[PDB]
Amino acid sequence: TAVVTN
Amino acid sequence: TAVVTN
Amino acid sequence: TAVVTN
Amino acid sequence: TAVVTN
């Protein structure tokens, strides 16, 4: 699980 | 699972 | 599962 | 499953 906000 | 906001 | 907003 | 908004 990878969750990114950029 | 990969979840990205950019 | 890949979910992307760009 | 791939879901993309661009």
Author numbering:
A (entry chain A), B (entry chain A), C (entry chain A), D (entry chain A): 1 to 6
Q: Anything the authors wrote about it?
A:
We found that 119TAVVTN124 forms a Class-2 steric zipper (Ref. 25 and Fig. 3D) in which the β-strands stack into parallel β-sheets with one sheet face packing against another sheet back. The side chain organization explains why the residue replacements E92P and V94P hinder TTR aggregation because the proline substitution would decrease the shape complementarity between sheets in the steric zipper structure. Moreover, the crystal structure of 119TAVVTN124 is a Class-2 steric zipper, face-to-back arrangement with parallel β-strands and parallel sheets (Ref. 25 and Fig. 3D). The side chain organization in this peptide also explains why the residue replacements T119W, T119Y, V121W, and V121Y impede TTR aggregation. Taken together, these experiments suggest that the 119TAVVTN124 segment is important for fibril formation.
Amyloid aggregation of TTR occurs by dissociation of tetrameric TTR into monomers; these partially unfold into amyloidogenic intermediates and self-associate into soluble oligomers and amyloid aggregates.
